[model samples]
Target: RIIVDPTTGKRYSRGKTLGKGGFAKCYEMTDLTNNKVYAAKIIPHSRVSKPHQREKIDKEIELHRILHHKHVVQFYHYFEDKENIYILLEYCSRRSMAHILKARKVLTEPEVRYYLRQIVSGLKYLHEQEILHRDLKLGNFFINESMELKVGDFGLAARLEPLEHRRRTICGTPNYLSPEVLNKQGHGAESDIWALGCVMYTMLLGRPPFETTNLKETYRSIREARYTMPSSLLAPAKHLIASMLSKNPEDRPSLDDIIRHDFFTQGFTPDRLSSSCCHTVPDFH
Candidate 1:
């Protein structure tokens, strides 16, 4: 079906569905004239009828649309008709790191390094632009056809406040929520760093660091900064993860500090990953 943007008069044709989450559903769409494809996120107006809900969605669009990093999912266009909010974004063919981790379980450290390097670079860009991703789990890190990781899903993203050491609500995935954020100390750049630690640990261990059988205990453990460091992890990765998961937000390593750490410096991070890495381990030899 052809959907036209009244503001720009550009038309696109909708294709098959890609995925769905709550009221936001993704579908493949093609630009009728240029034939370029996009992963169109369709949000029905009825789904966000409440004032606060609509404002939350609008904030995601406003914050994501201005981002222009290669590792960040490209937000191409946005337009709405009477019924829906249509957001056209880069179509990532390889799904996400979540799917990959599901298939391969634990990933090698080199593979971890490759993905983390890109993530840190992308995150550095976001922090520089004064935005916090808020959610940084494997599912939000999308993989393109070429195996590059593009950070996506800005539903919880927010601009950094001038007085960021303030109050807020608890958002983001429970497993990745930082100690300070779990205690409601508004999410900041360091909070994102804490999630990155969870991401790194998950990729290597095939499970989140602070996951417990119940939400209360999980939140308790996170607030206490209590998590086991497996003996399997190498020293550098262990050191990096420990630094990131530091109890005080201020003690967490900055993005620049993360990039310069021995985990990345001495590690063998492949410049490119094979699409096969999505399903199988990559061969270094």
Candidate 2:
């Protein structure tokens, strides 16, 4: 019966719909046994058109199971029926980094510091385990009511340096894709940082750093690394972002180096912030 979580014995109940995607749908659910709520993603087997798609879903589940961190959306448990797979996950406030960027043209120093610190901390953790979240975008970042940020979306995630060899897949959002990757060259974790720079730019400027109106020209902008931010950004913060956007993948600062940047020197860590965002209005000062 669906009465208890096979892994933790927790009880759960259906609630509101959290989201929907091409492959699955997520709902807000109540965990009766723990008296807490969670987000449950349901992937209907009937909806999967082919065996390969089903395999992809299964791999996504396994990947989430092996990873855990404060800045990562937590997966609590999983279950399946003859026609569907359900993944029970922690509930996150529904603020999207993309939506916020649309509303607030750019964030102030403190706000950037707040978000940048969380990403750096989370990425550092992932890097230590050799996990690479190849896709990093404003839409993939979830912020709670407190403004805390969590990296989301695992469909394109892959383990770098797998047991046998390295990966060379060319996949990632176009606007945020790294120069090397767009050039059809294989890359390591630095790819995430390249997307990180794009995200930071959007958070501050309300649009992508590279925009040429013409799609082909946009690619050229990325290829040439033809984007720049105002010198007004604090030196350390600017330096950290610049390093992340370095054209040479090897030249980009490693996630660990990003974590140690002086911008996060306030002793604040991802664990220190609640899993929600606190900013209501854009505070420039």
Candidate 3:
């Protein structure tokens, strides 16, 4: 038997729950006739009572629908029933980078470079689209069965209006915030680059660069650009991250500049794998 959403006429058979969170629940779902798997994000109408919150969710849906990149999560379609709204999305079997980091503690330099390249590649696409991923961190990057990383969770993303326009909303994970973001000085593409640097730091050291148990101290450290680098990091990698973590957005290198950095080009290549890597490279079954 086929099950169709009454409102949209879309059909899918619900399966087990994939994950649960404060306001929404993700579930495993399969196309009724095609037998293909997908993930569905179910948000209760009760959770979106506020007009502003509902508008934000609608904007997120718009942004997600327009984005199409290999390194970005795919959004299929969205519809609603009487009680809830359903957002169908791509299913990444391997889960998120945060989960991987939790299990491996840290990644080798080569692995970090590999993942970083994918992230920057994705960011390049997003920038070209005039979209800013306000919240970027390990938890928002998903890995597929083939170990390819893709940027996900676009709830905080927004489209840029003009060349000089900047967003002042102080949103995003504190540990990954840029100096401008912390100061509420308005942020743009550079803010995402700064967060990328923090992400690279986390991969190398197993924790965020400015991590502190207290949120206030973390914010202060971010504002001051004060973070310790491990002595074991290579000189080129350190230099690249230093440039990325610059307090001035204009001082920070752009995505194209980052891609051309010596750290990325000196010896790194997709075909080459570093044997000195400590953690086992994730494999596909």
Candidate 4:
């Protein structure tokens, strides 16, 4: 389904490529009239060969359209040309958390806390809306020029019921997969929390907790909840990671619980957790 933009009668000019993946390529787009910048995710219909693949893209557009939280990427508009579909999204020039980690190995505790607050708040809002971000990783969390973080890439997001949530789809980056997801025990929002814990560990140690050369060992490590943290980490931070990575999803903490943990209380406030660092301009009319 293609949505025609109601924005200015003027059109946007495509710029250079910002990033590219298997299914889509993101480009820098310039609004001709105002000279404003945006990211255009160009996806070809041929790539979405399967019905489920097309459904995933459609669901991403649908969920992102209504998700207006400060920590979630803003969707501007969508349209399609004869060869491809285009999704206009807020552009973050500062790159992603994954890029930062690659350059600067690990982050200080305070820095991790700041990013965590935003992530927790964003996850809280998503969960409240009964949406499970099945693929929460450092790569999917983007940062802007102001150092504000926004969760992007909703292609794997799934809708869930609070009490009866269960997804059989075996998808997600293997290193961050929750035990239930790996075991095929039917997973829910807790799967996201498990992935979040892996991300937190990565931010602190510069790598995923369960790192292995092959899929077999990685699955074993995730299933057994085998991972080590540095003694340099604060007690509270360690505790939070441990609990969140618990093998049983039943024992994992909710987003609210993580927000209230003492580790995040040093300089972080729950109220400011949802605040945006990079403000998005109002969408063009």
Candidate 5:
């Protein structure tokens, strides 16, 4: 009837897997005492065997715990068991865009624009706070039952604390990374913007920008190139994306600039999207 917490001797109940992450197989857990649901991330103890890996988890809590603005996911608490480490996050019944994209394959531009504004708002908050959400891939954008978006998975937050104090390094999100980040100039607000570009590209199209066969294909292909914009995107769409993913980090658009960009201004965007769009295509006026 209940699962015991090894740390506090409290009780919790595991629900279905929200989704698997880079290291965690997350579950929607219920705190039996309060009957409240939470996005509980359960990570295998084996994964933390390494010093660096465990360290990253430690940092995630420290940096991520206090972060909850209008659009960032709220972090709760973490506990551990013999087999796993558990962390609770704000629960969202609708899950993430990663779920949506996988099921829907592709999302329409208005939907893309709708999601984009939310992401930009969340990211804008993160950047202003001097936080680096190095992993800005689609998977991190979680959605609630009301179809609202919140940014999660601050895996790489405060990663370069030694930067001005000294220096930095890398995303699996290799396809979303800006050349500047790869060059070790460190992850700036624009590096996040580069990820912003890649996500919009994925939402509008069905695939990533540099699609070959596998991870190595993306890693191998980043040597020296301007990257290609698929001819399928409209002029304003293509223009904004090109500038957002600029080779020079400084050239990338600011969050405000992106909102004012011709694509969002001249092109079309919906005020809100139905949760149905997560699984099926929807037509607009």
Candidate 6:
């Protein structure tokens, strides 16, 4: 049985390097005791010296204690060592959504809607509990061997209303950021919905709705919040994505509204999927 003490020694023998990030490398490890596998994200303490970064790490730990939704990845435990913090996460056999997009060439509308349904279910659960996940991008979404989409990576979550406008920060992947958030103005749950829209767009179109090499102009386009699809988009599918990408937070549809959208009913909702639900399909032109 391989047992790792994060402080002194590498407990699990690393087999292959899964991927590397700014702060750490995640790898696959097996529990010799039960012969089960898991992913351990090793975050080097030296790289994350800022108080906010450290706080985000701790915030993830604290939030996981409150969340138990199946659509959300289960947080097992954490190991704190002198030089690193090892977050033992659920082992997902299916790769990131980015990998799926590449493999499929382009997502059928149904595939995009399937993920949108599951993710919104998870997001609705989180929002109901007053937690906000600030960073939601395609890379942050994971798939399991069962092909179930699970929302992963909650390093930027926080309870609602704690931080006023002054406390809010402009920090997230540029492409997926909501215009309001990127401008350093205060934002709330709607920012996540905007990112979800970008994910859906990428899945179906193989790229973002807006494109630009210039960073400022790209953000300006997002702020403009205008997205028009060709006639190829089925009415219901177009409606859902447009609702998700609405620039005005008030105009943006809630998770509840999305589950009720006809696209989900006709396309993705499974009969046995009690873990998530969508309203019956409605009449639309």
What are the per-residue Cα lDDT tens digits for candidate 5 across 156-255? 7774454476244554344365666666667677778877877998898878765533354555454342677788788888888788877777777789
For candidate 6, write residues 53-84 as lDDT tens digits.
78867878888756888788878767876677
Number of the top lDDT candidate: 1
Task: Please give the TM-score that candidate 6 achieves against the real structure.
Answer: 0.83
- Model 6 worst lDDT window (10 residues): 273-282
Residue 206 in candidate 4 has what lDDT?
77
Better of 1 and 2 by lDDT: 1
Kindly provide the TM-score of model 1 when superposed on the true structure, using C-alpha atoms.
Answer: 0.95
- Expressed as tens digits, the lDDT of each residue in 1-285 for candidate 3 is 334788767788888888984567888878766678887888899999999889878988999998889999988878887877888888888788888788789876667778888999999999999898888889888877677888988888888744356656676444466788767676688888998888888888887787634376667777788778889899998999899999788899989999889988885456443332223664321
User: Whole-model Cα lDDT per candidate?
Assistant: 0.87, 0.71, 0.80, 0.77, 0.79, 0.71
Q: Give the TM-score of each candidate.
A: 0.95, 0.83, 0.90, 0.85, 0.87, 0.83
Task: List the candidate 4 regions with Cα displacement exceeding 4 Å.
Answer: 1-10, 33-35, 161-165, 172-175, 212-214, 267-285
Q: Write the per-residue lDDT of candidate 1 for residues 1-285, one digit (tens) a residue.
A: 989888888889999999896778889989998989999889999899999989988998999999999999999988998798999998999999999999999998989999999999899899999888888889889889988889998988887865455557776444477788667677878889998998999999998888734366567778788789999999999999999999999999888899999998886787888888888888763
* Greater-TM-score candidate between 3 and 6: 3
As for candidate 4, its clashing pairs are none
> 200-229, model 4: which lDDT tens digit per residue?
888888778876343765778778887777
lDDT digits (tens) for residues 194-256 of candidate 2? 888887777766667776243555667787776777766767767777777887888987666
Separately for all candidates shown, the number of backbone clashes (residues 3 or more apart, or on different chains) is: 0, 12, 0, 0, 0, 1
